[PDB]
Write a protein that binds this ligand. Sequence first.
Ligand SMILES: O=c1ccn([C@@H]2O[C@H](COP(=O)(O)OP(=O)(O)O[C@H]3O[C@H](CO)[C@H](O)[C@H](O)[C@H]3O)[C@@H](O)[C@H]2O)c(=O)[nH]1
Ligand SMILES: O=c1ccn([C@@H]2O[C@H](COP(=O)(O)OP(=O)(O)O[C@H]3O[C@H](CO)[C@H](O)[C@H](O)[C@H]3O)[C@@H](O)[C@H]2O)c(=O)[nH]1
Ligand SMILES: O=c1ccn([C@@H]2O[C@H](COP(=O)(O)OP(=O)(O)O[C@H]3O[C@H](CO)[C@H](O)[C@H](O)[C@H]3O)[C@@H](O)[C@H]2O)c(=O)[nH]1
Ligand SMILES: O=P(O)(O)OC[C@H]1O[C@H](O)[C@H](O)[C@@H](O)[C@@H]1O
Lengths: 206, 309, 630
Amino acid sequence: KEKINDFVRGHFHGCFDFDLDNTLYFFIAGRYEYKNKGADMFIEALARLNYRLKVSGSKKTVVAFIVMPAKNNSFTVEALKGQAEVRALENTVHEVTTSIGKRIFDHAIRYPHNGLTTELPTDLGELLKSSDKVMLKRRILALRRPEGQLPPIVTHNMVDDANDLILNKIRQVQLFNSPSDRVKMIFHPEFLNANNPILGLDYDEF
Amino acid sequence: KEKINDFVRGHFHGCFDFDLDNTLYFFIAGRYEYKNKGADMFIEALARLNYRLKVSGSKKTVVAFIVMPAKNNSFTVEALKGQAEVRALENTVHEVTTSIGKRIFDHAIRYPHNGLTTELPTDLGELLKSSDKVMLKRRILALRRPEGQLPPIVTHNMVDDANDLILNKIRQVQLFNSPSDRVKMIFHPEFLNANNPILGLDYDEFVRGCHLGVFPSYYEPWGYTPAECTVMGVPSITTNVSGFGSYMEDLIETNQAKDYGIYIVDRRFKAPDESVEQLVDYMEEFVKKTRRQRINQRNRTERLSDLLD
Amino acid sequence: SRDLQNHLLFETATEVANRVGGIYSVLKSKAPITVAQYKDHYHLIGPLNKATYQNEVKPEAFSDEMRPVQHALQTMESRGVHFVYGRWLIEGAPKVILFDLDSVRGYSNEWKGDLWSLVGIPSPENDFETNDAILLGYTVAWFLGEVAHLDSQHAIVAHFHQWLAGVALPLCRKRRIDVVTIFTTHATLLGRYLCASGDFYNCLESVDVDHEAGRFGIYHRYCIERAAAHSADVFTTVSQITAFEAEHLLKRKPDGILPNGLNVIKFQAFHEFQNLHALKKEKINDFVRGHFHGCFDFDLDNTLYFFIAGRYEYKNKGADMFIEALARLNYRLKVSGSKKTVVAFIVMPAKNNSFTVEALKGQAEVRALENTVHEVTTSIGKRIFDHAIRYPHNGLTTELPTDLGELLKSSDKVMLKRRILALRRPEGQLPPIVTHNMVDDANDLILNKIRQVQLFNSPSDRVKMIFHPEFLNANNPILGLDYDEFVRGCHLGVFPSYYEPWGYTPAECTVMGVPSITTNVSGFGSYMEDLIETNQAKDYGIYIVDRRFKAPDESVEQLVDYMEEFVKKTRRQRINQRNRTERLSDLLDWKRMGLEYVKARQLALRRGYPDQFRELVGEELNDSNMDALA
Ligand SMILES: O=c1ccn([C@@H]2O[C@H](COP(=O)(O)OP(=O)(O)O[C@H]3O[C@H](CO)[C@H](O)[C@H](O)[C@H]3O)[C@@H](O)[C@H]2O)c(=O)[nH]1
Ligand SMILES: O=c1ccn([C@@H]2O[C@H](COP(=O)(O)OP(=O)(O)O[C@H]3O[C@H](CO)[C@H](O)[C@H](O)[C@H]3O)[C@@H](O)[C@H]2O)c(=O)[nH]1
Ligand SMILES: O=c1ccn([C@@H]2O[C@H](COP(=O)(O)OP(=O)(O)O[C@H]3O[C@H](CO)[C@H](O)[C@H](O)[C@H]3O)[C@@H](O)[C@H]2O)c(=O)[nH]1
Ligand SMILES: O=P(O)(O)OC[C@H]1O[C@H](O)[C@H](O)[C@@H](O)[C@@H]1O
């Protein structure tokens, strides 16, 4: 589930208004038989489940996956690019916390001398400096989404996007991952695998 | 130098009141001959330097190492235990900052949503929790040292402490590492090694980490100790009655040679109490140097190593 | 009347509180050295950019001796003129005076009329910009008259940058305002325009200045530039090649050069710049592994990183030569059996739709391998450790493991192999020559040139092409470097320019210890070929290609010659050459290039008050140049 959470954090970069500790992951998977496998019901049922959860004022979120292989031209740039921009933040944060560590450790080993009245630092400014902030802000701006763009409902470029049953059905019931929706949709038109650069999980792990 | 800094932090746990970024590492080394190798003069000179700095009001700090093997029963528990207590803290800090990361990270990626009005956390309480603050304080507590205890002048338990010359000389000049002393004193009666559990540097590595070798010998046919120093771009103070000292006095004009890291004290044509003041002059000069200066001097000292090939 | 030892300085340009062009960065970086000399006697002047100025910008306001500046500001207020006073928020904190041109346009037709008779300059009012150039030039001379009038202690210097600011120069000359003037032109008008087609440097001695200016239809601007250069007590350019250029095309030899320095950020240790190089070289190495994923047949340790960067001017910046030359070098290197490799970067912004999937995906797959390795190596760690500590018990005869199968298990071998296969690229696919999706790929000039010389990053090629049509930035998810960080990590900048009045590209490059190849028709190349003998300058990291007294094809062959030279170097040799280049940086710091700005100002006071300067120094020194003076 941590590897999924990681994928999701990328996916909703810029539009991430919910709590993964209070988030659930439904999926459907298999051969793309829209009608026999019941993708139709699934999508419809989810659209309604969304309405119920909104009405009840629940704070939970459902991120719902469709793993049915359809013809595609691999991943989208937007998928790969935001998963990269989220790692960029992860890393800059790790660097910054290394610096904070030095600053804490100096205070801890220098107490009680040099006028260090408290055992630990108290002001955040003692630990976090302009150079540190500037990085973090730049990495944050990189995650900003455009004017009103919503997280996508598909991870790939589809061959025949306009005729795709699953996608037309999601568009029809209007699950577009706008913030208010407590049900999110992610169609991944490709069997899962560990080499997958955006959700590196063999199916069995996912 | 970092590896020496980790040792010193250990050694001074509790009584740590100076900045290692404005601290210099002098050392004397080799076969324990109190009189011949110049340890008498060294320790005295340092006590006089300690006076000069307090007087002149210097922000600097000197940690003077003595590496001369002597009869001993291995390390003190207090050196060995303090090393562990300083690492306990290093590893508690590393855990806390991880927690801090996760929080900073969550804020960044969530902003501007969920009522987050600033791009970064502003108040420290968002990052640093009580559970985190408790483990840290406990680690700090373990570094406290007893009422009026000071950092030791010895890293080992001596066989015959009460009669050892080096230890008695230090006690006599009254360098007990109190916070008001600008010169500290760490006698390590054992040849340095990488497997040393308090200071895990081979001798050559330690040399590089230090700032200034001081080998003010009285008898010394050659003196590899300052020669090795000089090969590693480390300024050394030696004497004209040493072989190496005499040789470098031939090759270079004695006032040039200070810019080239080879300080030469006069122990042939001067009173022993004038020798000591010249050795103190040279140390007080080096302490006055900026980092610009030390680095440049170190490059000159390095470039000089061709002559010793 | 006036004092020359304590004088005022009023620097005036278009680009004060707004980064419209190169001139921005000159004034900005120079401000620290010019504040430090003058303190409160220095004042920058320009037009108030209502939009962006919000970013960058009482009896207490001035001292007693600098009260005359305060009184003259109130006299501009007494005819209604709105003006922003303050500090410019950059190193040095110089004081700015930003005139509102919206609150002086009611004079426009009168003032454009005045120019018909005072100098004779037409003003087609369908030219949005020359209007603003005239409004500033009159508003500033309306101010400099009042300060010369209200201050009778100091001498006064008024420096103007580029033709747009210098409408005020004829007005200071004709009206006989009591200030000494300096004009500095960073590029001639005709020069930029004549270089459109292409042979500028040979056949500019004979060109009809008025017929040519008239044919491009920019005669009304040319007039303002020509007027400015003649009017001023001192006329200057930013480089010798531009001085040559300015002599024939503006009809006045300059009194000297004001070459553009940089605010050189120094380190406490000199050798720090060198450690950075290797750090940032590793970030590029990370990129290059991702790029060649699957076709990775060379040793990055024995690999060099050439680059060109800047505005996308295919001809002027010399991308044409760079690519042609790189193709020829590839032949040489193959012929000569060299084992080295060159990855050449072109960093010139072109219209794109961000990165390719292949680019992002490739470096994602390389990170997956990085991490699966990291998992496997901890397992190996655990096994080495357990053999170590258990020795010599349980039958362990050797101190350490000797069979790899002891440390690397099936489970570990499988996931490494899977990661390997993921990097495998389609049969006969090569590494791309572009990181992005181009909007108009088939018509991109760089990509046509590259396709034509057939640098396609096949494994036999010792020169690889990477066109990255976008300025470098830290946030970039494939090559996460700010431009400065990338430069440092590279080994050789190559900026074989044709029209380039200065070129900060190679100067920046040199500041950060990186050798460049520039040309003798660039302003920076002129200035170094004067300061250093040209064969010696190669040892200090300044390779200068002759694009003036050589055929285009010989220039190319010289550029190839120089690269081949640089490739041949050993690592010691590159490291030192880099050290020599870094030592050179002080010549480009404002702590030296700002002395030439004083020489211009000492010559302005010499011609302006010949008797007063004679008596304040001793005799009268030579009058003709900046260089001929004290
Ligand atoms: O990312 C994924 C997702 C699913 N799977 C695998 O794919 C299978 C999904 O099964 P299908 O959707 O292919 O359909 P079934 O195999 O359940 O059933 C099919 O095969 C049966 C026996 O051949 C019948 O013939 C039946 O009519 C036909 O629907 C699962 O076992 C699962 O392990 C993956 O490997 N990777
Ligand atoms: O922690 C340490 C410190 C030093 N050393 C090494 O051991 C040497 C110790 O030097 P000494 O104190 O033994 O002095 P020298 O070897 O410079 O000279 C000595 O050896 C000479 C030749 O035998 C003469 O006898 C002379 O009187 C005597 O001073 C150093 O050079 C260094 O190489 C270590 O291995 N570990
Ligand atoms: O990835 C990059 C690459 C370059 N740069 C910067 O972009 C500049 C490149 O400048 P250009 O090549 O666009 O041109 P110049 O700054 O040399 O000069 C420009 O301004 C001059 C005077 O205003 C002339 O008009 C000239 O013709 C015009 O190109 C460099 O300073 C460099 O710092 C980046 O920030 N990121
Ligand atoms: O010039 P290069 O071949 O990139 O190598 C250059 C060198 O850079 C710096 O000097 C580093 O300290 C060395 O680690 C490296 O050997």
